[PDB]
Design a binder for this molecule. Sequence first.
Ligand SMILES: NC(=O)c1ccc[n+]([C@@H]2O[C@H](COP(=O)([O-])OP(=O)(O)OC[C@H]3O[C@@H](n4cnc5c(N)ncnc54)[C@H](O)[C@@H]3O)[C@@H](O)[C@H]2O)c1
Ligand SMILES: NC(=O)c1ccc[n+]([C@@H]2O[C@H](COP(=O)([O-])OP(=O)(O)OC[C@H]3O[C@@H](n4cnc5c(N)ncnc54)[C@H](O)[C@@H]3O)[C@@H](O)[C@H]2O)c1
Ligand code: NA
Ligand code: NA
Ligand code: NA
Lengths: 336, 336
Amino acid sequence: YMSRYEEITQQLIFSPKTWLITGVAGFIGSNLLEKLLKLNQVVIGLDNFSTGHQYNLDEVKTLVSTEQWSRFCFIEGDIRDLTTCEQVMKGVDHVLHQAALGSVPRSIVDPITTNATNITGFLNILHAAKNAQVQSFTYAASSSTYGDHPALPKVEENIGNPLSPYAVTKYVNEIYAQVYARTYGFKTIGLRYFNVFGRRQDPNGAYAAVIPKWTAAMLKGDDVYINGDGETSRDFCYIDNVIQMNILSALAKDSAKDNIYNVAVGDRTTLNELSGYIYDELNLIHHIKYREFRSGDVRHSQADVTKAIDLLKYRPNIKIREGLRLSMPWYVRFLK
Amino acid sequence: YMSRYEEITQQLIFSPKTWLITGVAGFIGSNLLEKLLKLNQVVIGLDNFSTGHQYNLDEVKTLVSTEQWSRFCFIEGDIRDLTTCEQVMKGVDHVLHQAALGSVPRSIVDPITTNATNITGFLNILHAAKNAQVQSFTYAASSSTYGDHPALPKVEENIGNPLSPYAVTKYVNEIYAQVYARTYGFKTIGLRYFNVFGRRQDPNGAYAAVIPKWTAAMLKGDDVYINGDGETSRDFCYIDNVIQMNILSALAKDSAKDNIYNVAVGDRTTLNELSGYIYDELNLIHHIKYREFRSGDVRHSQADVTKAIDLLKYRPNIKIREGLRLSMPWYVRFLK
Ligand SMILES: NC(=O)c1ccc[n+]([C@@H]2O[C@H](COP(=O)([O-])OP(=O)(O)OC[C@H]3O[C@@H](n4cnc5c(N)ncnc54)[C@H](O)[C@@H]3O)[C@@H](O)[C@H]2O)c1
Ligand SMILES: NC(=O)c1ccc[n+]([C@@H]2O[C@H](COP(=O)([O-])OP(=O)(O)OC[C@H]3O[C@@H](n4cnc5c(N)ncnc54)[C@H](O)[C@@H]3O)[C@@H](O)[C@H]2O)c1
Ligand code: NA
Ligand code: NA
Ligand code: NA
């Protein structure tokens, strides 16, 4: 029972607002789109189709009614262009900012465009939101911000030194957001996601995340790599948790704003057993090598979601195994 | 003496390197130019004349020989364009990055522009320097990185929360510089300047610094406005100490790199006593209203320069009194 979430969705259905989703055509963005349209919200999407796809939008078109779909206005555009940011903020109530170029190895290899997309793009959106006087601003942050902090589980107040240009950019999102609260009174929420997964996460590409990648390899009879000793642990978080948390943040009471929240489940799953988990779930629908560690890959990761539970009355309902069961069928249809 | 600093400056006269100065037309960049041409160095210049002036260059030209000027290649251009940053980096040995939009209140009214110049612009130069494989990289940091931390005098490893968009940019300069060391092995030195003053510091404008603003005011017989009770204090730093530190940092040994240093004197001077000093020094070349505190103004500022003294053999040799005595003539020539 997502009891607080249920109640908040009910306000939204009764008094529908206008939402902006940046990165609408990507994994998390499209999932947020799916839910808000089903809640009869008016949605304004912004995407440049860099990592995102037109087929993600086309899928969501088939998952919602006509009346619902007609309340979605899509704008092809770039968060790096401030003018575009201002144009899309007009009459927006709630801002869900997901647009960015993710991936740690990407930022190492092209820190320039990454900086532009993730810092310049963010500030453009943040500033346009302040000037449009939106009612809430919720943006995608990262567990990479913890950096070389050795403590476990990860507690928001305790971070270390950033280990990648990507870690930097997301921390800079946080800092700008705090300073926007200080100097302007503009209270935002930053969601440090931890290893999200689920339908519409891109399995292709040189930057594919481990769950869709491995899934994609098993469905093809390709080799499944484990980068090192296989002992690495991660806090895998199914999108529904992330959707719940964006919407709870969007309508949080004022005192809950200007805050950073871990978005995860609280569990630690080894790569050795993720390799196992996926196999079983895939093989329930009738269808392993080792190499090196990565420069920027931490031995262990696990969140403490106490703060979200307490402040936002957050209720993570889907753990890894059930997430994968809900996810595998999507990849079957998608990869054929 | 300035014996280690004199060791280097004499080494440079005998054996010239190629230097890149960004912000070369501004206050600090143009003083850096004066020194480097006087030591027969080949200097590459970059400036867009945004807060700097062609007259600062023109002035340097009159203080150096024809053959010294001949080795100054000046490029009108913008650090925000990566291509420009790479063109001005070819053949360069030591980078002195001074190009930025300073002032806190500028960044509160227009955070986008300050982000573009101070974060994007900085990263371009860092990135190009990295690629060009330069011998050293030294950049203009800021005492505002201490933020809200209560300690006084200020010590480099202890910092708090950035209190404005400008502070965020300068702190992010430091973070990126530490990340570049980690990810590419490219070791830089960042200089937390504290309230620099001297020749060619713009007395005109909304954001003119206190010393040049008051010196202009007393020569014109305009009002000297003291914001507050006048017990507000600062570590006023004469340019030669900044120049000194930049050259020390450019030719610093490997282990002294990837470090942040306070550039100041270690002293505290109140606006009250300061107005006394300015006035007294100006009367030897023969020629006040209190008001509401600047909002969010730092109450007291003072650097601990122990790190610079031990690791870079810094000598904070010119205190505020002597500096003002050396700078007063320049403002008389400039305003008549
Ligand atoms: N996926 C995770 O586990 C995870 C972990 C930490 C942080 N995040 C952050 O969550 C957010 C959601 O990303 P995702 O995982 O769905 O990846 P994604 O690539 O599927 O989504 C990113 C979306 O942003 C769009 N976009 C990128 N740059 C843009 C720009 N300049 N202008 C307009 N649109 C732009 C892309 O086209 C894409 O639709 C990102 O900020 C990501 O960094 C995700
Ligand atoms: N003066 C101080 O008390 C103080 C204190 C802390 C930090 N700093 C830093 O020292 C450096 C220089 O300061 P200053 O006092 O000489 O200021 P300044 O305004 O005199 O110098 C800045 C110079 O950079 C140029 N510039 C700005 N944006 C540019 C861009 N995008 N591309 C190319 N050139 C650009 C300006 O036109 C100017 O010539 C800056 O990084 C500043 O933030 C100064
Ligand atoms: Na409104
Ligand atoms: Na509410
Ligand atoms: Na180096």
